[model samples]
Structures are given as structure tokens and as C-alpha cells.
Target: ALWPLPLSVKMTPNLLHLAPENFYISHSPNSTAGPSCTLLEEAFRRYHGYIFGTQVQQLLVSITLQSECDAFPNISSDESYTLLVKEPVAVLKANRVWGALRGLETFSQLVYQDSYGTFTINESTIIDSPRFSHRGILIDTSRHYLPVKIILKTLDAMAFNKFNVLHWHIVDDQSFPYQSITFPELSNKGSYSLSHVYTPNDVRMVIEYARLRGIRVLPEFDTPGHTLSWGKGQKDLLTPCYSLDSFGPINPTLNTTYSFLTTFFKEISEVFPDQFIHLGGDEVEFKCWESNPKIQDFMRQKGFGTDFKKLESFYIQKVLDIIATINKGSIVWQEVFDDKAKLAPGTIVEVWKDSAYPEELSRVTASGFPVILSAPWYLDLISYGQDWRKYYKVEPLDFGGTQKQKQLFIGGEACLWGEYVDATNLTPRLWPRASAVGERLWSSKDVRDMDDAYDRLTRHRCRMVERGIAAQPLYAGYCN
Candidate 1:
């Protein structure tokens, strides 16, 4: 009854007891035939297994569907659903398969085991929809390579919170684990080892698994600043600094640089089905570019002064055009906007600095570009206790932007930047904390009751653990 807190819910005193043999699922013939329907059927199957483990049973629970569902997941698909529970039968309905997927999650949350160890759900009707179009979680696999199983499990946790986007920060300065068919050396030289690389098959596995749950996998090939790893394979990709160290802003003066980017991006663009890619434009050290004589010469040749910012814009614009030819949009860090560069239409700007400097939020949103806030929701920074409260309290539109500007705040993400994280600690680090942000993004802003949220979040964490997720404990208490 809580956590994300449904949009509208009404419960009756009447209870519908669920048993092993009594559960059943019925869907329209026109409904999605593969994974979507299979997933719904499996939901009931898993619930039944949870309740009646190795016990003999009779009677089948029935779930009837009245509408059609889409065959596959899409970014523009509807995710609104209605769940009605009456006496003998429970019904779930949605216009699309994605909505039906959400409805199934709501239905699962409603069921609870009683004192006598019997499973029952209150007779009720719940209607639900997310407040924001883009509720996401960022997983940085570059710093610590996450296995396909971990990625799949993360997606499961995301679905539990009704989150729709998985921002896959796949490469960074630390490593480049994603396999590149066009540039095999990128991963072969940059990754920890051959064993750590995400082969094309592995990438497909993560993407397809996420797709089944109606989650968009937005792969980030963070460039320019956090791309030292890219230079391990192609040293020419980096600019040499005054200190005799080669760093990345990947040589903007080289035509080969653009050609390499085009070929590499085109390959991944086809591999990843999403329309948007995160071309990270943050943390560029201008001194590195200024120190390089070749770059300084190139700047004068292009009739640009030694303005490193303009050079960044040039690199970003070229990359944007290359992605555009592949029919995809781009998302950059807030620094891109701060530089006053003219970005292509539909480019998403992610605000990351405004948590410490509040002015950046209003400035970016007011710029009239679509925005995604990740400032305060950085889950990687650790605190002693009750850290989730800080995340829960910060609203995406709290910076006093105009109403029209506020509309440009599409959503936000809880970023788990991976300077010090791996499969063992990553899940525990993200859960409960990330869930708080997920609820904030998906649930109504008015549903801000910290005490009640903690009560339900405790149960939700335990629920995730029960389902084999490595969710960290929120407090001292335990779920029985």
C-alpha cells in the first residue's frame, strides 16, 4: 500500500484468499504472445510458489485480461494500468503490454501472508501511472565490471520500483569493458582483462533482458574527459599535456578521430535499440588542450582563439551530427549548457552540479532544454545513516523555475558512479537509497510522508531480499 504509493487506491474489508491450484491467468488472444504474457503468467507462478512451497494444494487463482498488449517494449509506450479485485475473480487491464506489466507489479505488492501462513489480498481497485516520463538509475560498469546476471538483477529491482530507464554508464577513464567490433582494441587494451569485457552477446543479453521488463537501456560512452581508457588502444585519440601525460578530449584536430567515433557509435547505435545516447561532456581539463601545441595551432587554423570551451563544442557538435545520421538523440552533462554551446534540438541536459551550487538547476531548466537532474541523488557518496531522507526531500523542481520551465524537467536519475563499487557492494549500496529517488520520481510530489515511507520501504527492502536481491538493510529492524 506504500513505497511508491499508487496514484489512486481504495480497499474494502473483503479479502480474497489465494491458493496454489486456484490461481489462473487469462489474456486476450490479441495480447502480446511472447515475453510480456509469459512474464505475467510467471508472476502468478512465482507468487504461488512463494506461498505454497512443496505443499499439496487445490483451486486455481484466475487473472483475466480484457484489452490488447503490444508485442515489444518501446520508449513511447503507455504504462498506465488499472487493477480491480472483487470476490471470485481479479482483473488487470491496460491499453498496452507495458501498462499491464506495471499492473502486475501492483498486484504482487498487494498480496501478503497472514498469521496462519495464508496468502490474501484485500478487495480493492488501484490505478497507477508515473509522474515523470524518465525515472532512471545509473550503473557505472566501467569502474567495476558488472556481470550480465547483475545487470539483469538490477533491472528486476528497477521494475519493482516501476522505474523505466537504465542509464548504463558502460565506459569511463577507469576501463572500457564494452566490446567494439569496429575497434576491437578499445576493449582488448583498455579492459581489466579479456575475461572482463562485455562481448556483443553480453551486451545483447543485458539490452534484451531490460527490454522484456519495458526498461530503456541508454548506453553511455562517456567521452572527452573520462576517456583515458580509450587512449590505451589508440594513443592518437588523446592529447599530450605539458607534464608529458596523454589525456583525452579525443584529439579534435584529427579527422581520424571523427571517423573512428562515427564507426564505433554507429555500431553501438545499431546494437542498442534506444533513441538516446549519453555522450558525457563533463570534467574536461582545459589545461590539457592548451598545453598541446598541435591543438593550439589547430585552433588558430579554424579561426578560433585559444578558447578550450569552443573546442569542446566543436567535438560535441561533430559527435552529435554523427549520432543524428544514425537517427538518435544525444544527452550531455550540464557543462555542455554552461559553455553556452548551441546544442542540436532534442538534446537532453543532465544537471549534476546543482546540489552543491543550487543556481545551476534553475539556469539549466530555464535554458529551455529537456533536463534530467542527478545532483543530490548521487548514491555513490556514503553517509553514516538515514542518508535516504536527504535524497527523498530534494524535489526535481524545487529550484524555483517558472511553471513552463518546470515542465522541461523530464525526470532525474540516482547515479551510482563507480569509483569504488563492484557486484558484491553495488546492489546493497544502491537499494533503499535509489528506491527513495524512484518513488519521488514516480509517485506524486504531495506524497511526502517520511515516517510512512520508511515503514513501507523497510518492508519493500525485505521483499526484494526475499526475491533473491542483495538489497542492503535500511535500519536495525528485520522482516519476519
Candidate 2:
């Protein structure tokens, strides 16, 4: 029984035992398909964890892709797949390479072990596809620098769960380790040290690693507010607070601010090939702007009198204009929408305020913008018992909205803010819990039964442990 219940499935009692001789995976005779075969061969080895005797093969897994391999993974890529697991022969088919990647993950998840460690899968016919296209998990790396290996391992975990986006919170107030070719000083001066920075090559590796696993590397470079570290290197970027007589955030009054942003984002767009970029416009404390006499004078000269949100809107709109002018899509925090900032067309909104959920979803989608909810699924919030049950049932479409508005509700992510997290505990903290959000995003709505969910998550948690992830366990139990 596979988790993230496929869209359609019919399972029989028949078991398909897998071994080296009996279970070599086969695919179309094309150069593009070779990598998928290598992926599964290793996955098969991981599942068994033992050498299998060389003998006549008894089972065959044939993966077919209708589209060529050159098709890159993107927002609109076809991820639908149909897998027919008949005894002796299995067929995994999809329209695109991304779809084939998903199908391969499904096949990997289908495997289980018998009493004596024999790799096994049930006879099942499954037609599966994602309900929402932009299923993702946001990982904050700036709060604590994450190793490239850890980030790559994260992609491996995401592939196992079928999540397609890695919302990399690359830099923030705490640190600026995302190396910028346009401004090498950002990482050089802002990071903890040279050793802490993610070089261009490191980022390239992360992006390429994600690409092979059908995951998009959605890198984020937050500004305007979460840029104390950014300001450490970029001269005159922060606003001067009259009250504290110190700099707080990016100065909206300065022409250099927008000019620098334009340059920064232009470089960003060139590096990250993803169509949508997350411009974090949340938690901007306008106290600095409020207290600054110079900013006040500038606001009055521009016909704005102490309406700080309007000031924020002006700054945000200008940055948004830079992004739009560059022809890249935008994704901003719910604050951007809530503050009534005039967003560019096709901009996606991420909902993060838990108190403002279904109501927030309703309002955003009603205004003709698509949404991705993370309000109720923040993994950084710790708990005693199984907290994944909380993440399992927060429906995005539960908001009262018309079908048109509902279509605007694209997807959501489980955010793990790295305040107290690092490579050591990141996987253990996120896994199985994140997998819960994964199931919610991918599977149908009716799949949310508490007992059933708990069972599947526990089993899936064990699967993560078996697959070499540090996934934490359920209360007092042995996985084996």
C-alpha cells in the first residue's frame, strides 16, 4: 500500500518479490532514460540492503516517456503518470521526463520487505497525478548555513515524497551566504566566513541535483526588511531609523535601493531558471520609516503623508516593476496582498499567517491571484505528540470561494524556518511531517482519515528511516 494515495488504483493480493536477478529495471532504449534506470537500480539496492545472486531475471519494469528528455521541469510541466503493475511485468508511463521521474518515485515507494528481508511489491494498477502543480517545501538556509550535501539529500527526500519545488530561503537577516556574482561582497562581508558561503558552483550543483529529481530550485533572496546581513555589504541599502538613529531595512527613499535590487534580481533571474521568484514582502516593520524625519520629508514631497503601507506599497511596486520588466513571474508573502500592493499579473501569493487562513485564502483567490498555503503547516513549530495530524487536514480549498477563485488556489508549502535548525536536525525535524503535507498536496481530499493517516505516516516514516533519512520515530516503537 503506497502513501499519497494515487488518483486511481486497484491492488491485488499477489506479491512481486524483487531481487538483483529477478528485478532489474528496464526502460526505453534511449540515452535520456539511462539516468532514470540508474536511479532505480540504486533505489532497489537501498531497499534490499544486501547482495542478490546473479540469476535469470524474473520481473521486468519498463519505463516509457512519450516526450523527449530535453523538456525541463517547470511550473506547467506534465507530471501525470499511469503505472500498471501486473505480475511478472510492470509498465510505468508518462508524457514528460518529469512525469517519468514521478512514476519512478512511485515504484520506489511501492516496495516493502518481507519477514526475511525480501524486497516486495503488490500487484497494483495505479493512475496517479498531482492535484495541485506547485507542491513544495520552503527551507531557510540563511538562519543557519546548510551544507550542499544536506540540501541535495533534502531533494532526495522531496523526490521520495513527490514534492516538486525547493523554495530555498537562501539569504536573510541573520546571514548572506548565497554568493552573488554581481556583488561578491554580499557573501564575502555578510556571511559568517568564506567557508560558510555557497559558491556559484555549489548553487549550480544544487540546481542540477534538483533537476534530475524533477524538483525546481526556487531560490529566494529576501530584501527591504530581512536584509540586515545584506546591508552589511551593500552600502546605504538600509533605512535610517530616527528613533534609534540606526539602519533597519532597505531604504525605500533612495534611488540606489531600487537600482541595486534591479541589478541583484537581474543576476538572480539569469542564475535560477525558474519562472516564478519568491520576493518575500512579509514582516516589514515600518517603525524606521515612521520615525525618520528625512523619510517623512521624502514621503510628503511625494504626496504621501504618514500612510506607511502606501509607502511600503510604493517600494514593493517599484521592486515588482523591476521583476515584471525583466519578464519573470512573482511570488510574495500574504503581506504583499494584504497591504493592497498592486501585484503584477499572474503573481502567486504565499499564505503564512495561521490566524488568517480560509478567510485569507478566500480573499487572495477572490482577487484573481493564485495561492499556496503554509499558514497551518509550519514545521518549525514543535509539539509533543504527532503534530503531522495538524498538517494533514488543513485544506486549501476549504475557503468559501467560487470555482474561478478556487482555480487561483494553485498550491502550498511546509516551511521550516532555520532559526534553530541545521543539517544535523533538519531532516529528522522535517521528514514524515513534511511527508504529511506532501500527501495533502498530492492525494485527493477524501484521503484524510486520522487513524489511516497515522498508520500511513508511521509506515512512511519507517520507510524514510530505512532509506537512510534521519526521520524521527513514533512513540516508543522499533522500526524493524
Candidate 3:
């Protein structure tokens, strides 16, 4: 905790004045005091004395409602120390005005100081809510089938960095990594490593692990888009791709628009009791749709356009509805939003495109849903040093919007899609860089020092090692 704290935090707005001993801290879930937020707040309190000095007592720590901020009118994110800290003792107050109480935990850990370095906080602070509401990260397990032990280790790494949502990219074109009781055929045969699939209990274990770390594990099952593996087991459930003549049992015409989705989602939702079920809606090669006259006619009868993209969107929306019937909501790639298909106002959208486009998030939020930006968090980019920096600077607000719109921007996540990565290198590659992004999401914008962060990250890496993770260290010149 101490190592990662220094490496990840570059600035502190609430750390000023105060000697070392007498310390006091408090938090407000004033709105939603869930298990996750409470655990994080406790963690901050427990680690308080370890990270910061102890000679600081006489403090007024209050967990107030958003409206209570009016009471502590003297403190803001920028000037929190102004009236609060005046030498011997400082007053620390947390108001759960926006986002989850976990954000405050992030603020606390990120700003936690080691002894008294060059940390200073001015008076007259101005604090606002989040820019986006669903800051997240997507970890694909289909390609490599990351074990529960590995999943939990990465989760701890994620929580330390301040990530709130765990995007469980459970399945892909390659395999079905989830455990399924309703459709045993899917994971039993379709999973790449026959013994590696996630059973029903496995899913619960993952969700529980995420929750303990103040993270929500939102499971994803790539539907028609990445159905190659699933198609091998259930031919009737896939929409074939005709454009590229490939190997394997080639089937040009396949349709799953009828009963496959409802049944499949029914099974999928049962495993994930949470609110969101990610219906993967991207990179669907539609060769099978073009070949199947039935699928073609079905599309035409629905007045679907020539663009396969529209058809895919329709498919996504349909599955999303089925998932919604059981889960709290649905999350899809940016493509699903483009389909113009009817979506519930609560649908969460993840923007992964790199091209400069208008804020798709603005549209989703205007409709009353939150959004997360991953345009720059793609960890598959490889080069450790360069990739990590992108994660650190890519704030969700860069999308363009008002201050409130910014609050709608929850956070950003580093995606480890298993194209060129495996467990061996994934830990090393994602670690320090993710540590940077975690700070960005958890710390205030003022925390920005790559050189210092690099050194701190090295120590954090050892801490991770202490916890039994085979994580990699920062690059040669980056750490001590």
C-alpha cells in the first residue's frame, strides 16, 4: 500500500499542516453506503497512520451529505487545507455528493503522503463531482482463460489504482470462458483449454473478489459478433461470415435471431446477479448473414439497411433486452449505440474508438446513462513506457462537455485483450502503467509526475509481489 501510494500519487490537495501522530479520518456514503465503499473507507483509515505521519490529532472528520458541503464552505479540492489545516491539527470532511463513496477512498489513498515531502494544500478549495459515472477496465479471459487466482490478483492491482468497474470480457471469438449450467456444451466443448472454463461458482468467486476491492465485476459474453467458438458447439446459434473464406467447418448461412439469444442470455444473466451484463457488440464478420437467405430475408422484412452494422446493432439490442430482464442493465461497445436501436435509458456505454468523434458519451448521458472512456486505456498497445502514459493522461472529460457532463464521466480502464498478451507478460506490461491510470482515476488532476511516479511504482511492484502476484517491475530508467 505504501509503495504503490507514492508511485501512483503525484499531488495531494488535502495533505497540509499537521505534525505526525494524532490522525483522524471519516467518510460519508450519505447516499449509498454499500459494502464496497465501506471497505475502501476502512482501508484508508487503517493505512492512515502507515502512509501519513502520526503526530496529528485534534481533527474534525465528518461524512456529510452533498448539501453539507455548504457547511464546510472553506474547503474545496484545490483549497481544502486553507481553513482545515492550521498547524497542529486539521479538519478532514468527506461528502458523498457524487459518484460512489469509493471515489473518496481513492481520493484518500491517492493523496496519502509518506512523511512530509513537498506536499502543500492551499485554502479555498472547490470540489465538484465526477465527469463520467462509469469509469472501468475490460479484462478478457476467453483467449487465455485467466485463473481465479490471477483474476483476484489483477483486481487488487486495479483497486489500488482506483478503478471502479471490472469489465469481465468473459468470452470472445476464440472461446467461451464462462461456466454454464443451462448450456454445458458451451464451456465444456467450446472453451479453448477444456479444463479452463469458468464454472458457475467461478463466476461468483470473481464477482465477490471484485466487490471486496470496491469494484463491480460486470461480466461480458460476446454474442453474434465473436461467436466462432460458440458456433462450433451450437451451429444454430451463430450468424456466419461469408466475406472471408476461412478454415474449420465453414458455414455461410447461420441465424440465431430466433430463440438462441433469449435462452443464452437467460443462462448468462443467472450467473451474473449484478445489474450489468456486457453483450459484446463489435467486430462481427457477417459472412454467414450474407449467405443465409433466411437471415437476409429477415433483415429485409425488418426494413434493415444494407449496412451490416445496423443488423449487428439490432441483434445486440435484442440480446440486451433479454439480459435487462434479469440484470440491472446492459453495457456494450460503442457500436451498439450507433445502431439507433431502442435501448433502455440506463444502458452504460463504453467508448473505445480512437478517432476524434463527437462525445458519444454526451448522447448516452443526456439519455440518463453513465459512460466510461477507454480510447486511450487500450493496454494491448505493447510498449510499456508509451502505453502507460496514454492511460495516465486520457481523462474522460477530453470528450467535450459541461461540468456536470464531466461528472457523468466515471473513469477510464486499461484493457488487456488477449491478442498478443498472455499471463506471463500481461502482469509486467499492465502493472506500472495501470498504476498510472489508477492514480489518474483516483487522484485529483493535480497529481502528475511521471518521473516520481515511476520510482514509486517500483516499490508498489514489490508490494504486489509480497501479496503473491508474479507482477513485473517498472522499466529500467523509470524506478529506483
**Positional deviation of residue 48's Cα in model 1 after best superposition, in angstroms:** 4.9
Candidate scoring better on lDDT of 1 and 2: 2
lDDT of 1 at 275: 85
Model 1 regions more than 4 Å off: 28-74, 355-358
lDDT of each: 0.80, 0.81, 0.58
Across residues 347-430, which tens digit of lDDT does each residue of candidate 1 receive? 899988845435776776677788888988889999899898889988777777788878888888999999889987988998
Candidates' RMSD to native: 3.1, 2.8, 7.2
lDDT of 2: 0.81
Ranking by lDDT: 2, 1, 3
Better of 1 and 3 by lDDT: 1
Tens digits of lDDT, candidate 2, 199-257: 99998899878877778888777767898898889988898777663778788988989
- Which regions of candidate 3 are displaced past 4 Å? 1-133, 240-243, 246-258, 357-369, 384-386, 449-471, 477-480
Q: How close is candidate 2 to the true structure, as a TM-score?
A: 0.93
